[PDB]
Amino acid sequence: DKLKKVLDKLRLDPKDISEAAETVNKVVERLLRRMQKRESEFKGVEQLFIYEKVKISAPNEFDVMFKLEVPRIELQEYYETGAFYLVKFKRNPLSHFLEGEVLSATKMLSKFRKIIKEEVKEIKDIDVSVEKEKPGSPAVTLLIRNPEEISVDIILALESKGSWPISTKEGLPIQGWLGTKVRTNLRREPFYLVPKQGETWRLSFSHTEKYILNNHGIEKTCCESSGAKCCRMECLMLMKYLLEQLKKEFQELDAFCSYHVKTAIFHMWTQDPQDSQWDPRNLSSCFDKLLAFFLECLRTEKLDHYFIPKFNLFSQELIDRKSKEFLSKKIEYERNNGFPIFD
Amino acid sequence: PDKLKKVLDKLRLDPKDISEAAETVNKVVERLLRRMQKRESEFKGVEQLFIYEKVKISAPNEFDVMFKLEVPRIELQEYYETGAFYLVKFKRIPRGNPLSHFLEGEVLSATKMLSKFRKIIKEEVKEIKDIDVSVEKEKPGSPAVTLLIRNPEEISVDIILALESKGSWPISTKEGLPIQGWLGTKVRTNLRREPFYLVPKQGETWRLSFSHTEKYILNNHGIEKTCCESSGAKCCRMECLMLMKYLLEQLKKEFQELDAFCSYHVKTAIFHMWTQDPQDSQWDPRNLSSCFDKLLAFFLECLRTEKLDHYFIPKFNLFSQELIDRKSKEFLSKKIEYERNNGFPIFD
Ligand SMILES: [Zn+2]
Ligand SMILES: [Zn+2]
Numbered sequence: 001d002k003l004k005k006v007l008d009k010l011r012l013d014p015k016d017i018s019e020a021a022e023t024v025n026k027v028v029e030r031l032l033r034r035m036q037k038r039e040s041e042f043k044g045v046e047q048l049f050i051y052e053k054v055k056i057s058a059p060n061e062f063d064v065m066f067k068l069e070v071p072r073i074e075l076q077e078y079y080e081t082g083a084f085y086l087v088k089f090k091r092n093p094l095s096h097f098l099e100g101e102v103l104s105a106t107k108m109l110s111k112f113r114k115i116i117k118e119e120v121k122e123i124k125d126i127d128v129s130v131e132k133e134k135p136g137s138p139a140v141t142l143l144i145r146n147p148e149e150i151s152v153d154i155i156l157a158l159e160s161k162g163s164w165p166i167s168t169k170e171g172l173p174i175q176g177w178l179g180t181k182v183r184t185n186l187r188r189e190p191f192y193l194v195p196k197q198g199e200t201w202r203l204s205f206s207h208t209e210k211y212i213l214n215n216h217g218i219e220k221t222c223c224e225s226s227g228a229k230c231c232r233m234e235c236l237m238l239m240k241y242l243l244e245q246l247k248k249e250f251q252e253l254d255a256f257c258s259y260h261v262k263t264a265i266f267h268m269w270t271q272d273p274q275d276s277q278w279d280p281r282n283l284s285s286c287f288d289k290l291l292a293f294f295l296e297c298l299r300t301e302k303l304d305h306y307f308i309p310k311f312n313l314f315s316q317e318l319i320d321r322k323s324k325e326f327l328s329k330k331i332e333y334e335r336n337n338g339f340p341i342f343d
Numbered sequence: 344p345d346k347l348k349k350v351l352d353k354l355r356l357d358p359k360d361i362s363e364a365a366e367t368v369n370k371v372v373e374r375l376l377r378r379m380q381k382r383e384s385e386f387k388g389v390e391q392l393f394i395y396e397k398v399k400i401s402a403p404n405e406f407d408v409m410f411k412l413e414v415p416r417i418e419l420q421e422y423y424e425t426g427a428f429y430l431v432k433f434k435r436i437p438r439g440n441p442l443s444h445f446l447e448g449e450v451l452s453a454t455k456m457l458s459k460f461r462k463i464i465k466e467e468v469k470e471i472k473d474i475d476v477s478v479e480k481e482k483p484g485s486p487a488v489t490l491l492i493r494n495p496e497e498i499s500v501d502i503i504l505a506l507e508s509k510g511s512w513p514i515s516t517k518e519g520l521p522i523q524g525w526l527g528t529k530v531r532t533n534l535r536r537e538p539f540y541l542v543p544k545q546g547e548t549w550r551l552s553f554s555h556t557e558k559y560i561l562n563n564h565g566i567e568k569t570c571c572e573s574s575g576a577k578c579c580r581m582e583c584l585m586l587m588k589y590l591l592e593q594l595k596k597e598f599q600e601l602d603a604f605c606s607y608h609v610k611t612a613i614f615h616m617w618t619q620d621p622q623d624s625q626w627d628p629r630n631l632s633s634c635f636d637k638l639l640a641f642f643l644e645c646l647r648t649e650k651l652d653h654y655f656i657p658k659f660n661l662f663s664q665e666l667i668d669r670k671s672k673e674f675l676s677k678k679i680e681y682e683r684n685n686g687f688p689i690f691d
């Protein structure tokens with residue numbers, strides 16, 4: 001029952017989130033108007049996506065993706081990484097960001113940021129400012145004061161209606177969970193490229209991950225009014241909040257982010273697909289088997305990207321050995337001591 | 344005696360023979376579409392609604408193709424509280440659409456549009472002399488012009504003219520599609536956001552059509568997403584539909600008193616049975632006899648009480664007294680109970 005008490009404060013109330021929704025929505029609208037106006041290279045920019053823009057267990061933290069349809073691209077995998085690609089064109093206004101024969105991500109992102117910095121300064125109604133360029137952030141972040149501090153990440157992305165790259169052929173292993181009809185439909189949706197050398201883009205499946213979170217059960221009536229409740233989402237909130245609180249205390253956990261937890265629980269939902277395996281009456285058992293699974297990913301240094309199997313997030317090149325051991329010690333400490341961090 | 348699984352073996356379609364008929368039925372439909380998209384034609388923007396889907400469930404001979412027309416500028420009006428039949432008008436004075444040629448006053452005439460639609464198809468069916476296909480005679484109950492192809496295998500192709508409206512579904516369907524405790528509320532909302540359709544047959548009335556929705560439900564019939572998939576458990580929902588549909592088709596072949604009943608009655612009764620018994624375990628292949636019998640008992644209960652509501656329009660009773668006489672229901676009930684009690688001799 002202790003975990004249910006922690007979830008009681010982690011659930012977003014619709015009243016406090018609605019005042020932020022009204023503020024975030026209109027600011028993104030005004031930014032979208034300007035991108036479609038005058039002589040900006042981002043004329044056909046549209047928003048990708050309410051509760052979808054909010055970060056799950058992070059109140060008043062928001063994500064917005066500005067997609068740009070580019071149907072004239074030719075992808076080239078960058079050094080067999082599977083996730084990073086160089087974009088080329090077969091046979092126009094995006095030539096300003098072209099560097100030789102490859103479209104520069106840094107040139108487009110820097111110009112994309114100048115247009116956002118000019119509009120945030122032309123706004124004097126709500127007091128909003130642009131972050132300084134973070135090292136690991138392609139998005140342009142906005143600090144909105146409500147007076148409640150609100151952060152909104154504006155991610156520039158390229159939309160491609162073509163087929164998903166070959167590196168995702170064995171990705172999305174939901175055949176024994178969400179089924180093959182769902183997998184075929186999801187893979188027929190477009191895929192996205194966000195900047196991350198300076199001219200390489202990385203694949204983004206935020207739209208697909210959003211669908212899986214809202215359609216997580218093997219039964220269609222899962223977590224509905226006329227259906228059974230499960231604790232899949234509750235285990236994700238507890239696991240994400242545990243890692244967030246651990247990053248607040250120790251700077252040694254900088255190499256870990258929320259997407260590792262999200263990736264690890266997707267594999268758990270694939271390994272344990274049955275809705276009965278995530279009964280809310282067994283929340284402590286479900287959260288512990290998720291912890292044990294995450295610790296196995298840390299100690300074996302194996303956490304494959306759920307869409308790109310060849311790409312290992314916990315590889316030795318990405319995260320060093322001392323950080324994984326450090327995180328493993330802290331996770332085992334709270335796992336045996338009743339999780340004192342939640343207090 | 345596992346006689347039901349023997350009937351199903353002879354009833355399943357041979358993919359070798361259904362693929363040959365698929366190649367010829369598509370290219371003929373493609374040619375008809377090409378002649379529709381041409382200049383001087385009121386059906387310029389016509390399209391196909393949907394290879395393997397177009398063949399009927401228990402009928403390998405017959406195929407069904409719907410030619411839809413987007414009409415984002417029409418207003419609907421119920422025709423005497425029927426729920427299913429409507430008169431089609433325009434929101435304002437029409438200017439840019441050629442469909443005003445079929446106006447019978449302020450109401451879009453179905454017989455006017457269907458006649459010109461059949462004139463165009465009968466022109467192209469007489470132009471083609473390489474495959475030998477003819478347009479069937481005028482049947483009263485069918486708005487679709489039927490194409491009879493000799494492959495030499497005789498195959499029927501119903502070309503159904505339909506209007507596509509992407510607006511909200513009419514209020515007669517508000518309490519229809521009751522799949523909340525079965526396929527879920529998310530599925531129901533997504534289905535109700537797809538367009539709805541109107542088919543012809545006062546000669547200006549149009550009937551609602553949910554063939555696109557009924558097709559989704561057949562291919563997504565399980566409460567579990569993996570139902571009838573490779574990595575999932577097989578159920579017998581579709582097998583009971585085929586047996587029940589084939590039982591009525593064989594009874595209609597033998598008795599002319601069953602002209603009032605059609606396959607849609609079978610299709611409607613099983614959608615209710617799937618709502619009444621939503622669990623995939625209630626449709627286990629080991630219980631094929633139990634599932635097919637409890638379906639027959641449900642269909643006999645609909646004949647007895649003379650109530651079979653349209654699965655999408657609750658107020659529309661398909662077994663109403665003004666639609667089917669009690670003698671036809673008593674006669675169908677007598678014949679079904681005979682087959683149910685004597686091991687179904689008609690299957691032989
Ligand atoms: Zn659930
Ligand atoms: Zn099934």
